[PDB]
């Protein structure tokens, strides 16, 4: 089989720390794995190869020093970046050859991880989301109701926005903005804003119970992360906004 | 000039539940894995500085050999393997010369199944330490070949014997060697 | 003294003039008999005996199991050969030549590869008849040995010379006796 | 300069590689992606299914090409291929 899990998907560490990612495996044994560090466009880059069987590890190209790989499971691996900087902020994906593939090298990449190593914790803030009922005009002209959501002021950009209609969550009809419109983009540290519409209708957008609440999951600062600012601690909480049928 | 053959020769064996995975280069072992230690072992230490080969993949590749093995045992209406006796022979690394380190070679060749018992005897007494052997080296006609080594200082005082025993050999096969050779 | 059942698979890549013409060959053996096989030039499995038919059919049915067995000759053979030439195809160990009496005996030992020529010269001129060989002999340690014996009347003044021709050495090796 | 189709047009992505290949893997993408495991082309040619998909490996010029017989909104992306160099390690290095 195949499956992959890089524990800290969204991790935030002050410019100078130690963020450790854990490439794990499913129900297969991984004698060797790899760590690719991608960014916005440049094709996924190979940082190093890690393999149990004591054999050390082979850092590629030249990237040589810090960022220490400790493969011991043959199941797990571990990539602990050392110190930290706001240039090491990129995507970190990892694969893991299925020890039995033999020829036909069979690897399986993990979900990934975006290390948000900000220079100062004073740049973070989560967002609050609120629902928006359909216009009596749309529900008539089209017999359809496009309910629209949106969030206000989060950072880092860590959100698993879900649409739970009438209790359980449904993903048939949503649309979430690809890129954010940072509050004040022209300005360096602008927070981010993301909108999503949920057109469902079926003469339910305005019906009896119908309870639908827009949802947003925010990956907040680590427990062991420094926080001196007066404003509450930007923990990894879940903000929600609900709406009913009319 | 350069006409070669590389072989991946593995095997599983019931009911002994033992097996081996080894590569062959024109008849010489490049390396092998021991289901026993789960460590790959190159024939010439050195080779291991030129190539890598994780052991598991072999072990892994063996599991399937058992599975398949069983599957074929039944499909064959439980017919057993016909034993073939070994054909022992004693060799010396190089020509023997008194007081000059050398090496006795017990050459177990042309047999099957891949299961045997070898015992070095220096004047009836068996030797237990310092000896060495090869895995089950694959032959062309599909039987097996094996090598047992016993380094030693050549002399006339003592003599040696290789004692091979096989499930096709009614009585233990016994080979002699004494400071001399045909 | 109890029956034993034996699965003997054999994946044997065949190289010719290096990698210019390779030939995969997957071969299976229940106990010592070939049951089902795969020739890289036959492009698909074939049973040599009954016990393998089912095996031959089922593999020939799965695209993977065939898209692979075919891709062998490139992604496995050409591959490995590329990894081991360095230390095998090119391995070369010089012969240690010795000559002692009995009947004259010329012993060549510890050499590799096994290709070799051993000639006898009697007072400057090769003797072409009266020689008994032993053939190549593997030792299991990546080095062959062979002995060639010449039957003669060691008369005084005579000088015998063993000549050994081997890829390991640039100009043939020769040891004289007497 | 665009994939004009909500149905049909031809994806024409020429993905290249440096070291001699053994296995060819296809991964097109969205943002913060795990993959797009399309299909695998190993030293040979022609294997491309499921329509907008077309794997053409040509060792001669060291390059592949994935064509889509039918674009869509989902098929727009950032695409690239990864390859394992032969007689090397198991490492895979994507292209462009």
């Amino acid at each position: 089989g195949a499956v992959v899990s890089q524990h800290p998907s969204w991790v935030i560490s002050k410019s100078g720390t130690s963020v450790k990612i854990e490439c794990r495996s499913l129900d297969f044994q991984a004698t060797t794995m790899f760590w690719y560090r991608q960014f916005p466009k440049q094709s996924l880059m190979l940082m190093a190869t890690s393999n149990e069987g004591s054999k050390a590890t082979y850092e590629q190209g030249v990237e040589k020093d810090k960022f220490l790989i400790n493969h011991a499971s043959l199941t797990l691996s571990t990539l602990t970046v050392t110190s930290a900087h706001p240039e090491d902020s990129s995507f970190y994906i990892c694969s893991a050859r299925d020890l039995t593939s033999g020829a036909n090298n069979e690897q399986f990449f993990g979900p990934g991880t975006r290390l948000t190593v900000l220079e100062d914790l004073k740049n973070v803030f989560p967002p609050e989301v609120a629902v928006f009922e359909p216009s009596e005009a749309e529900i008539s002209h089209t017999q359809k109701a496009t309910l629209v959501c949106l969030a206000t002021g989060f950072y880092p950009d860590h959100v698993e926005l879900s649409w739970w209609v009438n209790g359980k969550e449904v993903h048939s009809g949503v649309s979430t903005d690809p890129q954010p419109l940072k509050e004040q983009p022209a300005l360096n540290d602008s927070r981010y804003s993301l909108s999503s519409r949920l057109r469902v209708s079926a003469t339910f957008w305005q019906n009896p119970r119908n309870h639908f609440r827009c949802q947003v999951q925010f990956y907040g600062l680590s427990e062991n992360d420094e926080w001196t600012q007066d404003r509450a601690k930007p923990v990894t909480q879940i903000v929600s906004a609900e709406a009913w049928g009319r | 000039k350069e006409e070669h053959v590389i072989i991946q020769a593995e095997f599983y064996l019931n009911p002994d539940q033992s097996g081996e995975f080894m590569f062959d280069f024109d008849g010489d072992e490049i390396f092998h894995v021991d289901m026993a230690k789960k460590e790959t072992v190159w024939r010439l230490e050195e080779f291991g500085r030129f190539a890598s080969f994780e052991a598991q993949g072999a072990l892994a590749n063996i599991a399937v050999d058992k599975a398949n093995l069983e599957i074929m045992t039944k499909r064959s209406n439980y017919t057993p393997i016909t034993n073939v006796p070994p054909e022992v022979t004693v060799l010396t690394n190089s020509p023997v010369e008194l007081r000059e380190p050398n090496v006795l070679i017990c050459f177990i060749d042309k047999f099957t199944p891949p299961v045997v018992n070898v015992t070095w005897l220096r004047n009836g007494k068996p030797v237990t330490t310092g000896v060495s052997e090869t895995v089950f080296l694959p032959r062309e006609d599909h039987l097996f070949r094996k090598f047992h080594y016993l380094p030693f200082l050549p002399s006339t005082e003592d003599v040696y014997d290789c004692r091979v025993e096989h499930w096709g050999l009614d009585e233990p096969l016994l080979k002699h060697w004494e400071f001399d050779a045909p | 003294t109890r029956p034993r059942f034996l699965w003997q698979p054999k994946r044997e890549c065949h190289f010719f003039n290096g990698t210019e013409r390779v030939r995969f060959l997957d071969r299976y053996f229940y106990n010592q008999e070939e049951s089902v096989r795969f020739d890289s030039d036959v492009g698909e499995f074939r049973a040599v005996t009954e016990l393998g038919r089912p095996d031959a059919e089922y593999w020939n049915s799965q695209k993977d199991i065939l898209e692979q067995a075919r891709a062998a000759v490139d992604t496995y053979c050409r591959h490995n050969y590329g990894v081991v030439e360095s230390f095998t195809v090119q391995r070369r160990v010089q012969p240690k030549v010795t000559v002692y009496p009995s009947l004259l005996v010329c012993s060549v030992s510890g050499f590799y590869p096994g290709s070799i020529e051993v000639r006898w010269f009697l007072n400057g001129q090769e003797e072409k008849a009266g020689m008994v060989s032993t053939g190549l002999i593997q030792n299991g340690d990546w080095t062959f040995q062979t002995l060639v014996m010449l039957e003669t009347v060691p008369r005084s003044g005579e000088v015998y010379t063993c000549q050994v021709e081997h890829p390991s050495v640039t100009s043939p090796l020769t040891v004289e006796w007497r | 300069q665009a994939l004009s189709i909500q149905e049909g047009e031809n994806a024409t992505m020429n993905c290249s590689y440096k070291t001699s290949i053994n296995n060819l893997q296809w991964y097109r993408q969205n943002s913060g992606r795990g993959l797009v495991h399309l299909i695998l082309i190993r030293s040979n040619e022609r294997e491309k299914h499921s329509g907008r998909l077309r794997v053409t490996l040509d060792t001669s010029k060291k390059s592949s090409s994935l064509l889509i017989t039918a674009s869509r909104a989902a098929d727009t992306a950032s695409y690239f291929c990864a390859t394992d160099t032969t007689s090397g390690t198991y490492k895979y290095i994507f292209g462009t």
Binding site: G102 | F21, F31, G57, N61 | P9, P54, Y58, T75, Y76 | -
Partner: peptide
Amino acid sequence: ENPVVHFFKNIVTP
């Protein structure tokens, strides 16, 4: 580092 010797993966029989 060090080139790895690939092994032909064993397939299951019917």
